[PDB]
Symmetry: C3
Subunit: 29 residues, 3 copies
């Protein structure tokens, strides 16, 4: 369904955001 | 409601994205 | 419509995330 598909994409963005924040932490050391 | 909950999560991701972009600016100085 | 507006905002966040990941790659060189 449409709503479920939307929720999945929001969740995927949440994962990428958490990955980036880890990366930013790693660059700063 | 479902739509409202979705909108709140999108907004939360928008905030994290803006925070990261500020962080990226700060790392570059 | 509401769903379409939501989808557009999710897509906009996806673009910003891809931009940030490119930026992170560029900072690391
Ligand atoms: Cl999102």
């Amino acid at each position: 369904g449409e709503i479920a598909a939307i929720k999945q994409e929001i969740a995927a963005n949440k994962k990428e955001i958490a990955a980036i924040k880890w990366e930013i932490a790693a660059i700063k050391q």
